[PDB]
Design a protein around this nucleic acid. Structure first.
Lengths: 471, 140, 493, 600
RNA sequence: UGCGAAAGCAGUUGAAGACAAGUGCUUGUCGUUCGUUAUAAAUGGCCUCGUCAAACGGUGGAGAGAGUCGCUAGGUGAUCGUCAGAUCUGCCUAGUCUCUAUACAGCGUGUUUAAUUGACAUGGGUUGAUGCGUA
């Protein structure tokens, strides 16, 4: 923000604001306050406005107001990037605006992939809600409905400078996954750093995995360890599963690639850092982004679904149990255990419940009519959520059309008991639900693409006293 | 801050006279770096084979760890010390097969070799660009 | 608005044999002084009290070295034959010494002229003379007579108690802390014998077998004792009467051993053990007595000692060599009218209702390259990278930052051969390192694609690509070779 | 978990009371103090014969025996080691009842006979507990009187539960305090459950509850770690202390088939949530938390085996998974003989690992919704196919595809309904039986592309399909879970270049290098030698497959002359590989005086 | 743009209208529409609140620097040259050998697992800017 002093043409500055300044205004009889609107153009999926009221005397934020800032997979509704000098990834040129509007409307109507699902996390200790914004995490308190913090979790040109013109084509590191250990004292984050264009090393992505800590009183997470290129070079971490309380007191996690490799990391007190305790070889030559991972509560066994095959791996030897292999009709999008007895597996065409004790399927529900090519691989995981006491939930979003598909959507939530025998409840919300997850209490929280978080769950003196107050 | 950076390849927590086998064995057991360096100063490949040939298999595994540390810290010693490593694997290969764990005990070698081999595709690209530009100005 | 982030220095993944907090402490014993004595220095002892002077026994004399000055301040040459100890008492007022003749002499520490007491312990040599730590009046003496007499300073005509039962030379004696009645002796029999002075004595309660002649016995804690003999040192538990740990990393026979606790190091406790192979090594009892540091000396080390826990000044590490050398390593530790006019600065608001603090903490001064990047001086930031005496890692960051900012071509436009060579000179050296190899490739690729024409007309640049071509080809051979050792290594597993 | 072979302890005497095998267990009492995880001694009371102490290891032996008259029945027996006024002594307490007329309570002290005492008990002695710390003997009587005695049988205290006909009493310890719970039958299948605390009065009543629907006559009862297990009519009812509330009911179908009267059942606990159940000569180890049969063993050389007692492991605290149980085995023959036998028991780690796939309890796609939005009979068909004549290809294909409304000859995502495994298996059987030789129906081509092709028919499938090249190729490309063994032998046996590459691609994609290596070790040294020869004569997947062979071949096996030719071949490839890499990168990549002619 | 793995595999980037400039014609544009899954460039760069000195605790290190004609392995030059070799008591690279404030980089010592203090009137004015030091 630049205050031009027109008498001498000088200028005073307020830099490193959280977003580009859509609007400025001087608010007061004596100009006591400045009201600003900030945009946060990093998030291309949505227009994230933040209203800032600064005290003009010392240019300190008197009041900063914004809602939750989720990053959806694709652009929603009629979100348009602001106008810039050039057409870039974060902006539109003068000419590109109209064609961009038309192309976006046509994508929303005609195309079939309509993935707007977003990743969100819930803090077990504090019940705060974590949104992985691009290169930063928002901590948002849904009980008070206010933001509690905004922290940068990656390197990059984040708030060092305001990108302009060609610099606006740069991509900051993207926080792909963010998870908490069951204890809640450790935060595990996975990041992808993208090289700049027009260099030899312009096609080698960098994958970083980080472990952070904080005390309950504190508010800022502290990076304790950093792993560069886990699992190898240019190999993503497709799934992260924090370990159960039984094994290492929840001080461990599992990471899984698209090559079927698994790696178990744990916090070692002697080392005082996280160490790669166990490894499985991603040696066969198969690529697939549809992987899911579940862990039994006792911690004895692990369920690793790779492509169309579910594998039962012993944790102790970190290998197949000595049936281990279950073939599925199509790719596994999700595996979860409602209880230790029953394992619920979602494939791209159906949803099945299989009892481990018998090794037989109890129920199978058709998902193909609703979920055909709408979501990319791995997002049905964030649409399906699972309680540890009562039951699980399925979220199905579908377009409304009247005489060609229309932008407006309708979502339906189904509560299912363990093994999917019966539907405890069936509800309809009038708008696309991006993410539904289980609060550690009985209730479930869900996020709607209007950034709305809903929940599904179970005398003379008397005359004087008035007069004296008026005066 | 003071966080520990690392990588995913660190599997640490998962016949002739003139042989210096006597000096090598003592240096390895006692962790005497100065005594070890004098042994490593020998560069005659005939000696290197013979010393490792008579060296006890158990002590060989510790020798591999030491060479991996010297190679990792000092890249210019990568050449002269590879012959030591290449003979250790050649001669005591049978012993190294019949050992409960390799990655944990040879984690230094795996990390050191992985670092070099990963640079190969980028180095070749630089070689092609340097060769192309060098040829243009020589012929002109 | 938020304060500008500081540029984060590049840190590659950790390599083997990183510096440890225990090593960083012990490397600080830097200043090395080598003193030459007339014969082997057999024993070294530190005064328990301030200023913590230490006494060295060599040949027929005992010398006390100042801690601060690191030089002799007192000399005891009254001994006619060889001297075999110079231990102080707990109070530090007295130091006792033994002789080959068998006479035990107790002098006043810091008064070599006065002799307080002279005891004829035996006709054979008296190698060990130690004051009892708990009780000052009683003095212990062990001789080649194989009887470890317990003397009293008051009664010097007869021993209070005569402990026997050793079938070989007894050259080691230890008092167990918190157990004043218990006394431990180690003989060349290989047996460590424990005696109780409260009882009749003269017969050990039990013996612990070391299997090699015991050179020194030390009590690390009230319940543990560490005994060094032969080629290893073993730690025994008195409650269990069995050895808990054993470390035999030494090559020659370990000779002397000392223990220091509750000193300002990262490690709470340390165990130093001379080797007779030139090595004195530090072990930590809290980590199963694992080695943590070591020093090497010219010849066999017969004695070692470290300054007590409460040194209160520069610490010392002392090593004693059979050649007669003494090695010392040290870790060093207006007008009244004007003041009345300006008098309130000292006040910190202790009596005030409200205390308000808005001063921002002083941040570390930024370097030139960081200032240029902050001010968007891409070309000047590149120039600062290649300056004499610039840290290699610090040069790698500015190159990475400019790449991260997307300013790699922008930094290379207004340049000619004169100002391109510094970048190419570093590239000639940076290509070798694994950390900076990939970054060098990106920058060298651009300069070739951006200065192809200047290359043809400039001879000096041309040789910078001939030799650079030579080196990258060399790195190719190293990277190909590393793949081959990788391949064969997979075969073994 | 495993069940060991029983080994004999002693042969029971031939007494009339012990001749009734059904009631034989009741006439043998096992002391609680002496039989545990760590004790090598067992004190046993055999009615009418004696009370004996036996050492188990290294060899079973009789260490002590106290004779008893043949007319007496042992109702309660206990033995404990402790110090008495101090000498280490072993206190033996046993309560005997003579023809319902007189009940005898006897305590014996031995030096590790120091003294012997005997009194008349008012009613049957059902349970005896010895408290060596306080030098006390506590007896619970069938009339409900809990009497506390010293070692001299001087009555110190007596407490009445106010109920008679007591049927069950069991002692247990929690947090260092002694507790006992009792059950008294009432009328109309009702039972008064009382929990008592042992501490002015030494006995404190903590909980008293009446339980309905609790029958004793056909119920076997045992208690472990705060849980009471009742076995009745094939259902194990779990009641939880201190209030004995019904928590769970577990059905055990293998007992539901038992005719009432002939099958002898015993039921004892062995560890947390795991119990021992015996039906005649079969012994079962069960996990009641996961409802799984951890182990089964049949004793073919005995008619019946009846569990008497088991040493119970607190596996949550103990690293030991091995314990012992004692029972009575009866032999087959006209003159049956009963013997005391001990079984060593491996109980396991108490994880879901042990119970996976071991259930003792023995699909159609459903719409997700019952009821203006953007859209993105098995048996009958088998019967129709079965009715067809042999070798009728057109009819078989027509019925399968037409009835199922399948449009393509290869599986698609629109055939998700047909994915029932049973229906597919029956069709496969028909295809084999109906058709043999050189002509198979197109339905087999569809099935081979089906993701849920049964594993049972994968073996030798390639052997069936070797005749027809097209159908062989189809199985390689898409047939799921083709076992690696047949893929590898076909790899080294087939000379077809195209099939070799396709087989190599399939092997690498679906199997790990560590797995594949083991089978290549099995292959003959000649077959691999021929394979190497072809290489010397996508290609990376073949080369990568070669690298696996050399690892499988190992160090010793390889031969120098062949290694030279292989070395020359690979050196040529490396040079070619380097050449192409250089090409690939290349594809990616004023004078003072001048004389000129003016253009005019 | 679609699919997929990140590699890649297929496929697009059209027409009308209006305006400006140059000469009805040519070119370029679009805060205009229809249809398809579908270089940049107006001299224009980010504030202030406290600096300096000396310590301490973890985290990294290619160590920061100086010698040793002491060893080991290489590469290579001037002149002469009977091609065997000579003088420069040749040079350079790497390792080793000796040594020092770990001498090098970074984060923190508002409470943290751990770890700090001290100096200054944070002003105004005059002179020197051919400043000061060095070759």
């Amino acid at each position: 923000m630049s205050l031009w002093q027109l008498e001498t043409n000088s200028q005073q500055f307020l830099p490193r604001l959280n977003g580009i300044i859509i609007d400025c205004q001087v608010l007061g009889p004596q100009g006591n306050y400045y009201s600003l609107i900030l945009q946060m153009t990093e998030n291309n999926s949505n227009s994230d406005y933040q209203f800032l009221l600064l005290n003009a005397s010392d240019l300190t934020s008197k009041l900063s107001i914004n809602g939750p800032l989720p990053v959806f997979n694709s652009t929603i509704k009629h979100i348009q990037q602001p106008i810039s000098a050039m057409n870039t990834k974060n902006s539109n040129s003068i000419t590109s605006l109209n064609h961009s509007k038309k192309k976006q409307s046509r994508k929303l109507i005609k195309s079939r992939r309509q993935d707007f699902t977003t990743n969100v996390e819930i803090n077990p200790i504090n019940k705060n809600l974590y949104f992985p914004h691009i290169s930063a995490v928002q901590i948002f308190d849904f009980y008070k409905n206010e933001q509690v913090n905004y922290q940068y979790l990656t390197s990059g040109v984040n708030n060092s400078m305001g990108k302009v013109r060609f610099e606006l084509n740069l991509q900051d590191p993207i926080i792909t996954d963010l998870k908490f250990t069951k204890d809640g004292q450790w935060m595990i984050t996975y990041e992808i750093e993208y090289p700049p264009n027009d260099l030899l090393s312009s096609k080698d992505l960098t994958h970083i995995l980080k472990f952070w800590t904080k005390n309950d009183n504190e508010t800022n997470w502290n990076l304790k360890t950093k792993v560069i290129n886990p699992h190898g070079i240019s190999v993503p971490i497709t799934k992260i599963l924090p370990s159960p309380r039984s094994v290492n007191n929840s001080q461990g996690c599992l990471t899984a690639d698209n090559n079927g490799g698994l790696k178990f990391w744990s916090f070692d007190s002697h080392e005082s850092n996280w160490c790669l305790k166990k490894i499985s070889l991603p040696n066969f030559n198969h690529f697939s982004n549809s992987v899911s991972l579940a862990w039994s509560q006792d911690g004895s066994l692990i369920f690793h679904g790779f492509d169309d095959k579910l594998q039962i791996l012993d944790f102790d030897t970190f290998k197949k149990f000595e049936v281990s292999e279950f073939t599925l009709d199509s790719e596994i999008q999700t595996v979860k255990l409602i209880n230790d007895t029953n394992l619920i597996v979602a494939t791209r065409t159906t949803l099945n419940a299989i009892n481990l004790l018998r090794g037989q399927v109890i129920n199978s529900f058709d998902l193909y009519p609703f979920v055909n090519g709408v979501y990319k691989n791995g997002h049905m995981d964030r649409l399906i959520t699972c309680d540890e006491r009562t039951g699980n939930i399925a979220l199905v979003i579908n377009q409304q059309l009247t005489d060609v598909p229309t932008i407006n959507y309708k979502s339906r939530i189904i509560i299912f008991d363990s093994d999917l025998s019966t539907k405890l409840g069936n509800f309809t919300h009038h708008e696309y639900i991006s993410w539904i997850g289980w609060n550690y209490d009985t209730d479930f929280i869900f996020l709607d693409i209007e950034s709305t978080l809903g929940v599904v769950g179970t005398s003379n003196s008397d005359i004087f006293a008035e007069q004296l107050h008026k005066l | 801050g003071n966080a520990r950076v690392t990588s995913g390849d660190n599997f640490k927590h998962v016949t002739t006279t003139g042989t210096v086998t006597v000096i090598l064995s003592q240096a390895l057991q006692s962790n005497d770096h100065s005594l070890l360096e004098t042994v490593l100063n020998n560069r005659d490949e005939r000696v290197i084979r013979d010393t490792i040939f008579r060296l006890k298999p158990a002590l060989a595994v510790i020798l591999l760890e030491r060479l991996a540390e010297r190679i990792a810290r000092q890249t210019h010693r990568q050449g002269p010390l590879n012959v030591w490593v290449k003979w250790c694997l050649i001669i005591h290969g049978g012993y190294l097969v019949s050992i409960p764990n390799l990655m944990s005990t040879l984690s230094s070698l795996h990390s050191t070799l992985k670092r070099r081999s990963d640079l190969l595709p980028r180095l070749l690209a630089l070689d092609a660009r340097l060769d192309c530009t060098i040829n243009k100005f020589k012929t002109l | 608005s938020t304060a500008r982030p500081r540029i984060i220095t590049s840190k590659a993944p950790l390599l083997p044999q990183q510096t440890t907090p225990e090593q960083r402490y012990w490397r600080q014993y830097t200043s090395a002084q080598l003193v030459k004595e007339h014969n082997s220095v057999t024993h070294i002892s530190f005064n328990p009290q301030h200023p913590h002077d230490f006494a060295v026994t060599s040949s027929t004399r005992v010398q006390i070295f100042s801690s601060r000055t690191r030089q002799v301040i007192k000399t005891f040459s009254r001994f006619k034959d060889v001297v075999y100890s110079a231990s102080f008492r707990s109070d530090g007022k007295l130091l006792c010494a033994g002789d080959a003749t068998g006479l035990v002499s107790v002098y006043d520490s810091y008064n070599p002229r006065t002799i307080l007491l002279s005891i004829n312990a035996s006709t054979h040599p008296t190698h060990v003379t130690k004051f009892h730590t708990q009780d000052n009046k009683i003095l212990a003496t062990a001789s080649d007579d194989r009887v470890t007499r317990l003397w009293d300073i008051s009664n010097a005509y007869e021993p209070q108690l005569e402990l026997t039962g050793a079938t070989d030379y007894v050259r080691t004696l230890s008092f167990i802390p918190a157990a004043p009645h218990l006394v431990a002796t180690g003989s060349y029999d290989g047996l460590i014998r424990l005696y109780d002075t409260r009882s009749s004595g003269s017969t050990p309660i039990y013996s612990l077998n070391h299997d090699q002649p015991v050179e020194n016995v030390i009590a690390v804690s009230p319940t543990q004792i560490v005994s060094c003999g032969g080629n290893n040192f073993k730690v025994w538990d008195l409650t269990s009467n069995k050895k808990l740990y054993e470390r035999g990393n030494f090559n020659k026979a370990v000779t002397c051993l000392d223990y220091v606790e509750n000193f300002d190091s990262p490690m709470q406790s340390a165990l130093i053990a001379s080797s007779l192979d030139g090595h004195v090594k530090v072990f930590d009892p809290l980590d199963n007595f694992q080695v943590k540091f070591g020093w090497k000396f010219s010849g066999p080390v017969l004695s070692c000692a470290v300054s007590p826990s409460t040194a209160q000044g520069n610490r010392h590490l002392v090593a004693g060599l059979s050649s007669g050398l003494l090695a010392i390593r040290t870790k060093k530790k207006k007008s009244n009218n004007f003041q009345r006019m300006m008098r309130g600065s000292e006040y910190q608001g202790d009596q005030e209702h409200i205390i308000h603090n808005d001063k921002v903490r002083s941040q570390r001064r930024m370097r030139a390259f960081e200032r240029n990047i902050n001010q968007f001086k891409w070309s000047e930031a590149l120039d600062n990278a290649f300056v004499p005496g610039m840290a290699k890692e610090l040069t790698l960051t500015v190159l990475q930052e400019l790449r991260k900012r997307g300013k790699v071509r922008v930094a290379l436009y207004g340049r000619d051969e004169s100002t391109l060579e510094p970048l190419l000179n570093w590239c000639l050296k940076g290509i070798e390192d694994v950390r900076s190899a990939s970054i060098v490739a990106d920058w060298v690729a651009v300069v070739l694609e951006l200065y192809g024409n200047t290359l043809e007309s400039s001879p000096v640049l041309q040789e910078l690509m001939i030799d650079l071509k030579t080196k990258v080809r060399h790195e190719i051979h190293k990277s190909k070779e590393a793949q081959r050792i990788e391949g064969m290594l997979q075969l073994l597993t | 978990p495993s069940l060991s072979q029983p080994f004999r302890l002693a042969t029971l005497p031939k007494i009339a009371s012990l001749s009734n095998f059904s009631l034989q267990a009741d006439y043998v009492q096992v002391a609680d103090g002496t039989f545990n995880e760590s004790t090598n001694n067992i004190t046993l009371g055999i009615s009418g014969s004696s009370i004996s102490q036996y050492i188990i290891n290294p060899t079973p032996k009789l260490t002590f025996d106290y004779p008893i008259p043949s007319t007496n029945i042992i109702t309660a027996c206990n033995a404990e080691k402790g110090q008495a006024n101090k000498r280490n002594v072993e206190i033996w307490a046993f309560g005997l009842m003579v023809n319902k007329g007189n009940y005898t309570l006897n305590v014996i002290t031995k030096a590790l006979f120091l003294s012997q005492y005997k009194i008349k008990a008012k009613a049957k002695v059902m349970s005896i507990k010895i408290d060596t710390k306080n030098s006390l003997v506590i007896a619970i009587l069938q009339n409900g009187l809990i009497e506390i005695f010293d070692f001299k049988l001087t009555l110190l205290h007596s407490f009445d539960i106010s109920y008679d006909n007591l049927k069950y009493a069991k002692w247990f310890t929690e947090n260092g305090t002694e507790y006992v719970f009792v059950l008294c039958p009432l009328q109309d299948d009702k039972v008064c459950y009382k929990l008592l605390e042992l501490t002015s009065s030494p006995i404190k009543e903590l909980s008293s509850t009446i339980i309905e629907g609790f029958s004793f006559e056909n119920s076997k009862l045992c208690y472990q770690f705060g849980k009471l297990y009742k076995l009745n009519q094939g259902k194990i009812y779990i009641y939880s202390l201190p209030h004995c509330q019904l928590q769970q009911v577990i059905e055990f179908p293998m007992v539901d088939k038992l005719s009432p009267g002939d099958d002898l059942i015993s039921f004892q606990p062995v560890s947390v949530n795991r119990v021992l159940l015996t039906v005649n000569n079969v012994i079962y180890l069960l996990d009641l938390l996961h409802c799984s049969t951890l182990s089964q063993r049949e004793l073919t050389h005995v008619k019946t085996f009846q569990l008497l007692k088991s040493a119970v492991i607190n596996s949550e605290k103990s690293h030991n998974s091995k314990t012992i149980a004692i029972g009575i085995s009866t032999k087959n023959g006209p003159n049956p003989t009963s013997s005391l036998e001990i079984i060593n028991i491996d109980v396991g780690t108490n994880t879901l690992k042990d119970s996976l796939g071991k259930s003792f309890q023995v699909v159609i796609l459903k719409p997700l919704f019952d009821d203006r939005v953007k859209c993105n009979h098995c048996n009958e068909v088998i019967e129709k196919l079965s009715a067809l004549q042999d070798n009728d290809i057109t009819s078989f294909d027509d019925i399968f595809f037409k009835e199922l409304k399948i449009k393509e000859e290869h599986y698609t995502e629109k055939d998700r309904y047909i994915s029932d495994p049973g229906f597919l298996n029956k069709v496969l059987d028909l295809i084999f039986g109906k058709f043999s030789g050189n002509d198979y129906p197109k339905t087999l081509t569809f099935l081979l592309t089906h993701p849920l092709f049964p594993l049972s028919r994968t073996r030798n499938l390639l052997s069936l399909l070797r005749d027809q090249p097209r159908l062989f190729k189809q199985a390689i490309v898409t047939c799921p879970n083709l076992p690696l063994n047949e893929l590898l032998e076909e790899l080294f046996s087939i000379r077809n270049r195209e099939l070799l590459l396709d087989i190599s691609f399939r092997i690498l994609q679906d199997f790990t290098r560590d797995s594949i290596k083991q089978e290549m070790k099995k292959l003959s040294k000649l077959d691999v030698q021929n394979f190497i020869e072809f290489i010397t004569s996508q290609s990376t997947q073949l080369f990568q497959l070669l690298s696996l062979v050399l690892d499988s071949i190992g160090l010793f096996s390889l031969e120098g002359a062949l290694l030279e030719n292989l070395t020359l071949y690979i050196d040529k490839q490396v040079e070619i590989a380097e050449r192409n890499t250089e090409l690939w990168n290349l594809i990616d990549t004023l004078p003072t005086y001048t004389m000129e002619y003016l253009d005019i």
